[PDB]
Amino acid sequence: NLYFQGADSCIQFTRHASDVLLNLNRLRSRDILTDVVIVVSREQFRAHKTVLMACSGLFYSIFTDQLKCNLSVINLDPEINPEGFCILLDFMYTSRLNLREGNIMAVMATAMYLQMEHVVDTCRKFIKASE
């Protein structure tokens, strides 16, 4: 079944949020309605500002600023690892975090900078299990 009676006595669709996210990622792959390019060192990543703000405390602060909300290019701190950013941008659009021994430190540092706390907490838990 695709729906259920929610706690508030309203009909709720089980797969709706994941289907919207799937379609937003499809728009990203096809470069449709993307309104910003995130520059990390020499790498560029096209995205939708609303998705970035919905997933990151840093992007939420930047795109609510009256002056920065209109910028089409956003440059991140040059210390940010582009692969770590790519993994997190993929996570924002998919709910899947490709965490590996070789990338976990850069993904954790990038999530700290981007203010994605649950991702930071998860990284710490996986690091603690290795020690």
Point out which residues bind a copy of itself (CB under 8 A): 2-3, 6, 8, 10-14, 16-21, 23-24, 27, 32-33, 48-51, 53-55, 63-64, 69, 91-92, 95-99, 118, 122
Site size toward ligand 9IE (CB under 6 A) is 17
Q: Which of 55, 62, 74, 80 binds ligand 9IE (CB under 6 A)?
A: 55
Cα→Cα distances 2→5, 11, 14, 94, Å = 11, 10, 6, 20
Phi, psi torsion values for 85, nearest 5 degrees:
-65, -45
Place of tokens 């790519």: 86
| CA pair distance 27, 56, nearest whole angstrom | 19
Give the residue among 12, 35, 32 at the shortest CA–CA distance from 23. Answer: 32
Q: Is 86 in the site for ligand 9IE (CB under 6 A)?
A: no
Q: How far is the CB of 29 from a copy of itself (least distance, A)?
A: 13
Query: Which of 3, 14, 26, 68 is in the footprint of ligand 9IE by CB under 6 A?
Result: 26
Between CA 94 and CA 77, with CA 64 as vertex, the angle to 5 degrees is 70
52 with 85: CB under 8 angstroms?
A: no
With CB under 6 A as the contact rule, the residue among 46, 117, 124, 127 that binds ligand 9IE is 117
- State yes or no: residue 115 binds ligand 9IE (CB under 6 A): yes
Site residues (CB under 6 A) for ligand 9IE? 16, 19-20, 23, 26-27, 53-57, 60, 115-119
